């Protein structure tokens, strides 16, 4: 029990860690792309007014 | 015998393209048309005419050191 159970504690803790790592990176890339397209939208109108 | 010249024309156009020959639209159009016309040929005496015309393009510029690759 207490030497094979905690052999799964680390398993599930590490997979939770990697899933939240990837969620953090996927939430940063969203911010990067929205900044990029906002920059495009605002630089495109500075040619027509 | 015609399959030989068709594969050879494929290799020749690939070499020409590696030598940055598509930087001049006139030359690239000429070579592209000669190549596609060789691949559709159906008598091995026209293919050799267009092959000598196509190889003249490589023999023109001096980028490939011919005397070396001709060590036989």
């Amino acid at each position: 029990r207490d030497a094979a159970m905690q052999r799964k504690l680390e398993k599930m803790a590490d997979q939770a860690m990697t899933q939240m790592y990837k969620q953090a990176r996927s939430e940063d890339k969203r911010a990067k792309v929205t900044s990029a397209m906002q920059t495009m939208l605002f630089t495109m109108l500075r040619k027509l007014d | 015998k015609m399959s030989d010249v068709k594969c050879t024309s494929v290799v020749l156009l690939s070499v020409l393209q590696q030598l940055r020959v598509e930087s001049s639209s006139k030359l690239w159009a000429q070579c592209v048309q000669l190549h596609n016309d060789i691949l559709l040929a159906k008598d091995t005496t026209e293919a050799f005419e267009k092959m000598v015309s196509l190889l003249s393009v490589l023999l023109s510029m001096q980028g490939a050191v011919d005397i070396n690759k001709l060590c036989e």
């Binding site: 792309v33 397209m37 495009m40 027509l48 | 156009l13 690939s14 598509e22 048309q33 190549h35």
Partner: protein
């Protein structure tokens, strides 16, 4: 094309061409010899006059008080009518003609012979200048109704110039059939997105509110809000996918390589994309040759290759859209063919699904323009929650998003 004797006789009797045209073997074809359109369009005015005289005949029948069925085979190619052998007589002012087989059978010939081309001429004179329409006018709703009342006057079905007011899908087909014809009179710069200036955070944008279509008429968005404070992800997506601000802010373009109407040039120099030749796998070729393959006079020989192309290959191939003409279909028959075709699809089931039930195989495929400057489809399927996608979907049920 084996026996088209009466067509030849008709084409030369009214000086559409001359007998030496029919020795150009392939004269009938459409994609080779695309000049047959110019010789068909020379029958346009005989057909226009036929339509006008059938309206006159319908009016005379209505007033005089006669009831009968008009058929095509009772009208010579001048326009005059005859054969009154099955008409019956009722009280005047209350006669009624029946034009259903006439008009619906005739319909496909009105766009082959371009019969209404004399209506974009100064009076309707083929000898006068064109009508100079206004450049900012995009809603020709009364001219459609006037054309309908001039040519198809006794066609008893309701015609909605804008199919937004239609009653089902068969009514949509019926009214778009007429829009297809009438839209060949108006200027081709009045179709497309309908931009309009909005303000967000005290800055003006130009964005499409809804599009005018050749088949569907005018369509206006329902949730268009002037004066906004900030844009969410979804609104950034729907304002970066529109062609409004891309085409409003680029150089004007005149491309004489194509006949397709060219809008704008998004940057200062045109790009010519080529195609390379394949690679030779010499080991397999040698191996095949060493076992008796490719000997001269054999059954199997090499005919599939990698063909290379030069710069004028993308546009010279896009120009094949010149083969799409404005066809107007026979509607009383299409409205039966559609029922049988639908009966062929009776053992399935469909409907809407939520964003958490879609299946996307291969999320590494490009995302179109302009989204392919920032990532593939994975980036836009990860950056939107299951509520941004659902907001988007439920948004396109009330608005029109044109794309590129």
């Amino acid at each position: 094309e084996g026996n088209c004797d009466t067509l030849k006789e008709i084409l030369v009797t009214y000086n559409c061409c001359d007998d030496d045209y029919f020795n150009k073997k392939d004269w009938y074809d459409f994609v080779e010899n695309p000049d047959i359109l110019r010789v068909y369009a020379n029958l346009g005015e005989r057909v226009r006059q036929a339509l006008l005289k059938t309206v006159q005949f319908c009016d005379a029948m209505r007033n005089a008080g006669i009831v009968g069925v008009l058929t095509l085979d009772n009208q010579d190619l001048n326009g005059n009518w005859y054969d009154f052998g099955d008409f019956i007589q009722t009280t005047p002012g209350s006669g009624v003609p029946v034009v259903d087989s006439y008009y619906s059978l005739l319909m496909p010939i009105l766009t082959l012979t371009r019969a209404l081309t004399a209506e974009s001429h100064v009076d309707t004179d083929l000898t006068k200048p064109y009508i100079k329409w206004d450049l900012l006018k995009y809603d020709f709703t009364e001219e459609r109704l006037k054309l309908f009342d001039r040519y198809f006057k006794y066609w008893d079905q309701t015609y909605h110039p804008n199919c937004v007011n239609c009653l089902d899908d068969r009514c949509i087909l019926h009214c778009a059939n007429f829009n297809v014809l009438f839209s060949t009179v108006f200027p081709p710069t009045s179709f497309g997105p309908l931009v309009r200036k909005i303000f967000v955070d005290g800055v003006p944008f130009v964005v499409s509110t809804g599009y005018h279509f050749r088949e569907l008429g005018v369509v206006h968005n329902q949730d268009v809000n002037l004066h906004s404070s900030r844009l969410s992800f979804k609104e950034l997506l729907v304002y970066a996918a529109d062609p409004a601000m891309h085409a409003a802010s680029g150089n004007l373009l005149l491309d004489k390589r194509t006949t397709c109407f060219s809008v704008a040039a998004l940057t200062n120099n045109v790009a010519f994309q080529t195609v390379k030749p394949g690679n030779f796998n010499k080991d397999f070729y040698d191996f095949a040759v060493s076992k008796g393959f490719f000997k001269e006079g054999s059954s199997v020989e090499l005919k599939h290759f990698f063909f290379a192309q030069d710069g004028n290959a993308a546009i010279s191939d896009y120009d094949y859209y010149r083969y799409n003409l404005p066809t107007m279909c026979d509607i009383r028959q299409l409205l039966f063919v559609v029922e049988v075709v639908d009966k062929y699809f009776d053992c399935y089931d469909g409907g809407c699904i939520n964003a958490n039930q879609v299946i996307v195989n291969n999320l590494d495929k490009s995302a179109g323009f302009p989204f392919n400057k920032w990532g593939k489809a994975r980036l836009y399927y990860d950056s939107m929650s299951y509520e941004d996608q659902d907001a988007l979907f439920a948004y396109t049920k009330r608005n029109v998003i044109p794309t590129i």
